[PDB]
């Protein structure tokens, strides 16, 4: 009766890790989509020409 | 020990210009065989103390309007 | 582009990049439309007035250039605005950026010879009950309801191509309703033009398409300008009794050339290195392609986004001024399909919803209910395995597969290419057909047999006579 430790334990970690891989961890990846926004920012740095370089 | 006191709506030149005008209130120490010590605190309240005297003027020199007191005054 | 209807003007001044600052009349000055052939260097270029000074030296824009010329070059004055030479009769060669030809001679069929800037949006005598349309396809007229003269915008990748829609689009839109299916292009490549038109040479559409394409080798004025030969060609044959449809190339040219031609003249604009002048012509230019009452104007929206720019006009304008995308992944294609278009986000707002009918209510809620439910049951369980496979994995995946690779119907673009058939999908097969038989009814269809068949019309007779 002691294969259902290692077993449970090796197959709840890796049935935890394989769907909390892409449900946990991966979720922070969704915030890389706000990067997308982040580049537009990159626009203002623009801004600061009318003040000196377009004057 | 002595501080040059100094408002919030004071004249541009105290906080434009402590630097040279502490020199010859701190230099009597200095340079006369003696320890002496220049507490130069709160810098960014003066080294932007210039920038207003600078884009009133109709002159841009340094960032996010402001003077050439980075390189030469520095 | 004008007619010149007194050779006068003047002299001309500065001469100094782009800018015709020439000084042609005192207090006679033309319209906006209305360029001044100058006689710069050998040839008559002629330069559009954007906007007119007092004086003499107004602000003109040419398009080409001037081919070396002096200070003061002599101008010419004009009558007509913009007299260009189109008409219905250009569908037989391909096009110029000024209504000549590219290929051979004829200057693209000469006809008519009006005026070059046409209507945009109009109501009044124009269709304002917006029907819709039939392409005849199992997986383009069944998934998505297109209107009648709409703006479909376009998304994905590769798979389908130039030659499935129009060797597909040439054949079954022509037979199937009357009209003259033409094309554009701005910021193509050079090489292209001596490979794509060979195309032409298997489907017989040179005849019955105008390619007006400018390559890329000319500036922004030069290769920009193909708007008055879709629009002023375009509207001798939807306003006669046929229904017109272009089709746009890239978005780059417009975009890069109104943006960067626009901001760098010495004028501010938008922000985010955009132009002020998006608005005007994304929604004056994306509405013109309505339908009316002697023809629907249906335009291809093939633009491109800036690597799905939100923060910029890309998403706004062709996700706001577009009706619907359809999207085409590498995954229909790389398994040996003949639709690469999925099911997934490739529909309209009256296709899916209820404003329709029963028909394509049922048929796409049930498509999308069993491609939606049964897509994870083969993706998401081949990690584990097979053993907790019920009626629904044996039912959703027998049936997703067959269906999703039994639906794909040939058209005609194969029919003179490769050598299949298939003719044209019905909607009456394609919608009374997947949306009963292909969810736990009558599983005698295989995945061999099933290939290549006209949506559920020809798969019927496929599982018991072969």
């Given at each position: 009766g002691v294969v259902e430790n290692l077993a449970s334990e090796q197959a709840a970690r890796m049935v935890a890790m394989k769907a909390a891989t892409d449900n946990g961890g991966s979720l922070?990846?969704?915030?890389?989509?706000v990067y997308n926004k982040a580049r537009q920012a990159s626009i203002t740095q623009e801004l600061t020409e009318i003040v000196s370089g377009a004057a | 020990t002595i501080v040059v006191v100094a408002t919030a709506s004071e004249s541009a030149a105290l906080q434009y210009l402590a630097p040279y005008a502490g020199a010859a209130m701190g230099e009597y120490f200095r340079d006369r065989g003696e320890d002496a010590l220049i507490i130069y605190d709160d810098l960014s309240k003066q080294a932007v103390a210039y920038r207003q005297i600078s884009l009133l003027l109709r002159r841009p020199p340094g960032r996010e309007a402001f003077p050439g007191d980075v390189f030469y005054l520095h | 582009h004008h007619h010149h209807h007194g050779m006068a003007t003047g002299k001309i001044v500065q001469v100094i990049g782009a800018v015709v600052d020439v000084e042609f009349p005192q207090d006679a000055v033309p319209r906006v439309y209305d360029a001044l052939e100058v006689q710069n260097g050998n040839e008559r270029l002629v330069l559009e007035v954007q906007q007119q000074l007092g004086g003499g030296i107004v602000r003109t824009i040419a398009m080409g250039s001037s081919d070396g010329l002096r200070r003061g070059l002599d101008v010419k004055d004009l009558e007509h605005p913009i007299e260009v030479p189109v008409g219905k009769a250009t569908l037989g060669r391909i096009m110029n950026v000024?209504?000549?030809?590219?290929?051979?001679?004829?200057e693209i069929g000469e006809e008519e010879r009006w005026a070059i800037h046409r209507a945009a949006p109009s109501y009044e005598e124009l269709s304002n009950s917006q029907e819709l349309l039939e392409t005849g396809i199992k997986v383009i007229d069944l998934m998505a309801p297109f209107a009648k003269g709409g703006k479909v915008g376009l998304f994905g990748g590769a798979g389908v191509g130039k030659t499935v829609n129009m060797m597909e689009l040439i054949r079954n839109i022509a037979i199937e309703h009357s009209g003259y299916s033409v094309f554009a292009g701005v910021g193509e490549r050079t090489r292209e033009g001596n490979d794509f038109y060979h195309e032409m040479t298997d489907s017989n559409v040179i005849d019955k398409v105008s390619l007006v394409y400018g390559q890329m080798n000319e500036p922004p004025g030069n290769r920009l300008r193909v708007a008055l030969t879709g629009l002023t060609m375009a509207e001798k044959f939807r306003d006669e009794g046929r229904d017109v449809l272009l089709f746009v190339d890239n978005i780059y040219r417009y975009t890069l050339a109104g943006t960067e031609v626009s901001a760098l003249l010495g004028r501010m604009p938008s922000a985010v290195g955009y132009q002020p002048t998006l608005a005007e012509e994304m929604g004056v230019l994306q509405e013109r392609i309505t339908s009316t009452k002697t023809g629907s104007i249906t335009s291809v929206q093939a633009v491109y986004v800036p690597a799905d720019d939100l923060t910029d006009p890309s998403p706004a304008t062709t996700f706001a001024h577009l009706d619907a995308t359809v999207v085409l992944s590498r995954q229909i294609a790389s398994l040996g399909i003949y639709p690469a278009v999925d099911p997934l986000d490739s529909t309209s707002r009256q296709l899916d919803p209820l404003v329709v009918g029963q028909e394509h209510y049922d048929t796409a809620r049930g498509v999308q209910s069993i491609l939606q439910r049964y897509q994870e049951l083969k993706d998401i369980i081949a990690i584990l395995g097979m053993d907790e496979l019920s009626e629904e994995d044996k039912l959703v995946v027998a049936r997703a597969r067959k269906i999703q690779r039994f639906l794909s119907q040939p058209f005609f673009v194969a029919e003179v290419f490769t050598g299949s058939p298939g003719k044209y999908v019905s909607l009456k097969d394609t919608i009374r057909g997947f949306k009963g038989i292909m969810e736990g009814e009558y599983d005698h269809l295989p995945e061999q047999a099933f290939?290549?068949?006209?949506?559920?019309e020809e798969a019927v007779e496929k599982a018991k006579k072969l």
């Open positions: 922070i990846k969704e915030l890389q989509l | - | 000024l209504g000549e030809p590219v290929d051979m001679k004829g290939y290549m068949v006209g949506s559920i």
